[PDB]
């Protein structure tokens, strides 16, 4: 195989920022060079990395979930929302690591470590999911997967979606319900709709927004029972249901409604 970057999850690897693209008003794609154009990251599908830096006198470590893969030689892509200072009344300082990243110049470096996470997608419908950090993975193969993502919670979902669509022999059908605050907050919309246009048989796409625009053909509001019933596969088909987003989205919007619809806890996983 190609040379792997992340050889031990406790080792730190400083990677150089080589590109940055605006995703929307507050979110960006940050691309970092791997140690050589021929290296791969070493990232089982579904796992994340951690970035670390000393910021204003404190150690700051944060996980980010690459949207690229081990097919992508020489680089790694992160999609990261910046939490700006002087914007939200409850958080006047903004976010530490995200603003630090936003301030980086091309050529600056930051330390990566990983990979980590309880879920690994092994292809052709097969998921290896550890109950916790100290247990063996349980191998669950499914015909379909429900995905509930809020905001930047789209990142692990997009890793899994892209891995599936690349393999013409992977017949797994993904049903994504993607929640954001407003229409302009819908991250990577062109990418998602390109995936729908090209893989409609394996990819079902639905949105909800807190605040909807005039003409809107999808859903509005926090994730609810109706959305889960109509836009994720039915419990009878025993799909896995994956969730990723703000903790209250998971706690108050997803879990009780997955219960109402009839998806058993055993079939559900939160990143
Ligand atoms: C396993 C895992 C993977 C993750 N992967 C990703 C990823 O791929 N991409 C990604 O963007 N994030 C990801 N997150 C979140 C990420 O780890 C950080 O929590 C996030 O970047 C914020 O960290 P911070 O240092 O910038 O903010 P902090 O200083 O730690 O905390 C600030 C918090 O206050 C709130 N806040 C501050 N300013 C504002 C503002 N202007 N508007 C609204 N709220 C505000 C936010 O809740 C914010 O998190 C992931 C989290 C986990 C647990
Ligand atoms: N564990 C992981 O692997 C992982 C990966 C990526 C992101 N995340 C998390 O996802 C979150 C993304 O934050 P964001 O700023 O992009 O989200 P956000 O504030 O823009 O909210 C996005 C959507 O989340 C839902 N939501 C927000 N607050 C809610 C509430 N109180 N009740 C019900 N639903 C609510 C809404 O549908 C909302 O539109 C962060 O908490 C981040 O840590 C986790």
Sheet holding 173-180, edge to edge: 219-220, 203-209, 173-180, 144-150, 240-244, 268-270
To one decimal place, what's the resolution in Å? 1.8
What is the residue with the minimal CA distance to atom 48 of ligand 1? 95
What spacing in Å lies between the alpha carbon of 150 and ligand 2's midpoint? Answer: 5
Binding-site residues for FAD, in ranges, read 62-64, 79, 81, 83, 96-98, 155
- The answer on 261 and 130 residing in a single domain is yes
Query: Of 92, 116, 140, which marks where a domain is finished?
Result: 116
The per-residue DSSP string of the chain comes to -PPBS-SSTTS-EEEEEEEEEE-SSSEEEEEEE-SSTT-B----BT-EEEEEEEETTEEEEEEE--SS-TTSTTEEEEEEE---SSS-TT-TT--HHHHHHHHPPTT-EEEEEEEE-SEEEEETTEEEE-SSTTS--EEEE-SEEEEEEEGGGHHHHHHHHHHHHH-TT--PEEEEEEEESSGGG-TTHHHHHHHHHH-TTTEEEEEEESS--SS--SEESS--HHHHHHHS--GGG--EEEEES-HHIIIIIIHHHHHHHT--GGGEEE-
Total length of the chain: 271
Protein residues whose CB sits closer than 6 Å to any atom of ligand 1: 48, 60, 62-65, 78-81, 83-84, 87-88, 91, 94-98, 152, 155, 271
Contacts of 59 (CB under 8 A, 6+ apart): 52
CB 50 within 8 A of CB 80: no
**CA 34-37-39 angle, 5° bins:** 60
Ligand 1 atom index nearest CA of 117: 1
Residue identifier of the C-alpha nearest atom 19 of ligand 1: 62
Are 44 and 61 part of one and the same domain?
Answer: yes
**Are 129 and 263 within one domain?**
yes
User: Distance from the CA of 95 to the center of ligand 1, in angstroms?
Assistant: 7
Residue 54: give the domain boundaries.
Answer: 1-116
Method: X-ray
Check whether residue 124 and residue 247 sit in a common domain: yes
Domain of residue 97, CATH code: 2.40.30.10
Task: Based on the fold, state whether residues 132 and 9 are members of the same structural domain.
Answer: no
* Co-location of 38 and 87 in the same domain: yes
Query: Same domain, yes or no, for 146 and 136?
Result: yes
Q: How many domains does the chain have?
A: 2
- Taking CA atoms only, the protein residue closest to ligand 2 atom 1 is 271
Alpha-carbon gap, residue 158 to 77, rounded angstroms:
12
Q: Are residues 45 and 136 in the same domain?
A: no
For residue 103, what are its two tokens?
A: 């301030």
Query: Separation of 78 CA from ligand 1 center, angstroms?
Result: 13
Pair 50, 146 in one domain: no
């Amino acid at each position: 195989t190609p040379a792997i970057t992340l050889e031990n999850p406790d080792i730190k690897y400083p990677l150089r920022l080589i590109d940055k693209e605006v995703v929307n008003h507050d979110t960006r794609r940050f691309r970092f060079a791997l140690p050589s154009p021929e290296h791969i990251l070493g990232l089982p599908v579904g796992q994340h990395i951690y970035l670390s830096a000393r910021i204003d006198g404190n150690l700051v470590i944060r996980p980010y979930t690459p949207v690229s893969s081990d097919d992508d030689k020489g680089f790694v892509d992160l999609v990261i929302k910046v939490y700006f200072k002087d914007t939200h009344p409850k958080f006047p300082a903004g976010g530490k690591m995200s603003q630090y990243l936003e301030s980086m110049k091309i050529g600056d470096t930051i330390e990566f470590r990983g990979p980590n996470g309880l879920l690994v997608y092994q292809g052709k419908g097969k998921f290896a999911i550890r109950p916790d950090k100290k247990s063996s993975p349980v191998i669950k193969t499914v015909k379909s997967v429900g995905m509930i993502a809020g905001g930047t919670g789209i990142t692990p979902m997009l890793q899994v979606i892209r891995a599936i669509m690349k393999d013409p022999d992977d017949h797994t059908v993904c049903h994504l319900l993607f929640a954001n605050q407003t229409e302009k907050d819908i991250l990577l919309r062109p990418e998602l709709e390109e995936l729908r246009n090209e893989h409609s048989a394996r990819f079902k796409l639905w949105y909800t927004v807190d605040r909807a625009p005039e003409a809107w053909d999808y859903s509005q509001g926090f994730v609810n029972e109706e959305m889960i019933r109509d836009h994720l596969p039915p419990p009878e088909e025993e799909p896995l249901v994956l969730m990723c987003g703000p903790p209250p989205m998971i706690q108050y919007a997803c879990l009780p409604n997955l219960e109402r619809v009839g998806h058993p806890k055993e079939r559900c996983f939160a990143f």
